[PDB]
Amino acid sequence: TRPNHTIYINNLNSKIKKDELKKSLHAIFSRFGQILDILVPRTRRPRGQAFVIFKEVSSATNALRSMQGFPFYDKPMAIQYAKTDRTI
RNA sequence: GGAGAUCUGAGCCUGGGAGCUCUCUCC
Protein backbone atom coordinates (compact mmCIF):
# COMPACT_ATOMS: atom_id res chain seq x y z
CA THR A 1 0.00 0.00 0.00
CA ARG A 2 1.09 3.58 -0.73
CA PRO A 3 -0.18 7.00 0.38
CA ASN A 4 -3.53 8.23 -0.91
CA HIS A 5 -6.27 10.67 0.08
CA THR A 6 -7.98 8.26 2.50
CA ILE A 7 -6.88 6.82 5.84
CA TYR A 8 -8.40 3.67 7.34
CA ILE A 9 -8.98 3.68 11.11
CA ASN A 10 -10.04 0.65 13.13
CA ASN A 11 -9.95 -0.48 16.76
CA LEU A 12 -12.47 2.28 17.46
CA ASN A 13 -14.76 1.99 20.46
CA SER A 14 -17.80 -0.01 19.36
CA LYS A 15 -19.83 1.41 22.29
CA ILE A 16 -19.92 4.97 20.90
CA LYS A 17 -22.83 6.02 18.71
CA LYS A 18 -22.00 6.28 15.01
CA ASP A 19 -22.80 9.98 14.64
CA GLU A 20 -20.78 10.95 17.72
CA LEU A 21 -17.84 8.91 16.41
CA LYS A 22 -18.10 10.63 13.01
CA LYS A 23 -18.35 14.04 14.68
CA SER A 24 -15.38 13.54 17.01
CA LEU A 25 -13.26 12.08 14.20
CA HIS A 26 -14.02 15.19 12.15
CA ALA A 27 -13.14 17.53 15.03
CA ILE A 28 -9.87 15.72 15.75
CA PHE A 29 -8.62 15.12 12.21
CA SER A 30 -9.68 18.43 10.62
CA ARG A 31 -6.57 20.13 12.03
CA PHE A 32 -4.49 18.28 9.43
CA GLY A 33 -6.51 19.55 6.48
CA GLN A 34 -9.85 19.78 4.75
CA ILE A 35 -11.87 16.57 5.05
CA LEU A 36 -14.01 15.66 2.05
CA ASP A 37 -15.99 12.95 3.85
CA ILE A 38 -15.98 10.68 6.90
CA LEU A 39 -17.44 7.18 6.55
CA VAL A 40 -18.36 4.81 9.38
CA PRO A 41 -19.65 1.82 7.38
CA ARG A 42 -22.19 -0.67 8.68
CA THR A 43 -20.15 -3.76 9.54
CA ARG A 44 -21.63 -7.20 10.16
CA ARG A 45 -20.19 -7.01 13.69
CA PRO A 46 -20.35 -3.83 15.80
CA ARG A 47 -18.86 -0.79 14.08
CA GLY A 48 -15.18 -0.35 14.84
CA GLN A 49 -13.84 1.15 11.61
CA ALA A 50 -13.98 4.45 9.75
CA PHE A 51 -12.57 6.14 6.66
CA VAL A 52 -11.40 9.77 6.67
CA ILE A 53 -11.13 11.15 3.14
CA PHE A 54 -8.88 14.21 3.01
CA LYS A 55 -8.67 16.66 0.13
CA GLU A 56 -4.87 16.38 -0.18
CA VAL A 57 -2.67 13.34 0.33
CA SER A 58 -0.27 15.35 2.51
CA SER A 59 -3.06 15.93 5.03
CA ALA A 60 -3.61 12.17 5.20
CA THR A 61 0.15 11.59 5.51
CA ASN A 62 0.40 13.92 8.52
CA ALA A 63 -2.88 12.65 9.99
CA LEU A 64 -1.57 9.07 9.84
CA ARG A 65 1.77 9.95 11.44
CA SER A 66 0.48 12.10 14.30
CA MET A 67 -2.58 10.11 15.38
CA GLN A 68 -1.10 6.61 15.05
CA GLY A 69 -1.91 4.75 18.25
CA PHE A 70 -3.40 7.86 19.85
CA PRO A 71 -6.09 7.33 22.54
CA PHE A 72 -9.59 7.91 21.20
CA TYR A 73 -12.59 7.20 23.44
CA ASP A 74 -10.26 5.14 25.66
CA LYS A 75 -8.67 3.14 22.82
CA PRO A 76 -5.52 3.58 20.69
CA MET A 77 -6.39 4.12 17.03
CA ALA A 78 -4.77 1.81 14.47
CA ILE A 79 -4.39 3.81 11.26
CA GLN A 80 -3.40 2.80 7.73
CA TYR A 81 -3.78 4.10 4.21
CA ALA A 82 -7.01 2.83 2.70
CA LYS A 83 -6.41 -0.14 0.39
CA THR A 84 -8.45 1.54 -2.36
CA ASP A 85 -8.65 5.33 -2.46
CA ARG A 86 -12.24 6.27 -1.58
CA THR A 87 -12.23 9.61 -3.43
CA ILE A 88 -14.79 9.98 -6.21
C1' G B 1 -31.65 -0.06 -8.49
C1' G B 2 -30.33 3.85 -4.81
C1' A B 3 -29.93 5.52 0.44
C1' G B 4 -30.31 3.70 5.31
C1' A B 5 -31.14 -0.08 9.74
C1' U B 6 -28.01 -5.22 14.37
C1' C B 7 -22.75 -3.66 21.22
C1' U B 8 -30.56 -2.05 19.74
C1' G B 9 -32.49 -7.68 12.66
C1' A B 10 -30.29 -12.58 10.87
C1' G B 11 -27.35 -16.86 8.35
C1' C B 12 -22.75 -18.38 6.59
C1' C B 13 -17.49 -17.60 6.32
C1' U B 14 -13.08 -16.27 9.44
C1' G B 15 -10.91 -18.53 14.13
C1' G B 16 -4.80 -13.13 14.98
C1' G B 17 -11.94 -10.11 10.97
C1' A B 18 -10.72 -4.18 5.73
C1' G B 19 -15.21 -11.58 4.15
C1' C B 20 -20.06 -13.31 1.49
C1' U B 21 -25.19 -12.94 1.68
C1' C B 22 -29.95 -12.31 3.58
C1' U B 23 -33.86 -9.50 6.23
C1' C B 24 -36.29 -4.88 7.25
C1' U B 25 -37.32 0.67 6.32
C1' C B 26 -37.58 4.68 2.94
C1' C B 27 -37.06 6.77 -2.27
Residue numbers in the entry: 6 to 93
Task: Give excerpts from the publication.
The viral trans-activator of transcription (Tat) protein uses an archetypal arginine-rich motif (ARM) to recruit the host positive transcription elongation factor b (pTEFb) complex onto the viral trans-activation response (TAR) RNA, leading to activation of HIV transcription. Using yeast display and multiple rounds of selection, a new class of TAR-binding proteins (TBPs) was identified that bind TAR with nanomolar affinity.
To examine the role of arginine placement in TAR recognition, we first considered TBP6.3, which differs from TBP6.7 by the change of Q48T and T50R. However, we observed that Arg-50 of TBP6.3 displaced Arg-52, usurping its role in Gua36 recognition. Arg-52 adopted a new conformation that protrudes into the TAR bulge to interact with the backbone at the pro-Rp oxygen of Uri23. Thr-48 had no deleterious effects except that its side chain is too short to hydrogen-bond with the phosphate backbone as observed for Gln-48 in TBP6.7. Although TBP6.3 contains four arginines, this variant exhibited 8.5-fold weaker binding than TBP6.7, which has three β2-β3 loop arginines. Similarly, accommodation of Arg-50 in place of Arg-52 pulls nearby Arg-49 away from the phosphate backbone such that the Arg-49 guanidium group hydrogen-bonds to O6 and N7 of Gua28 rather than N7 and the Gua28 phosphate—as observed in TBP6.9. In contrast, TBP6.3 cannot form this interaction because Thr-50 was replaced by Arg-50.
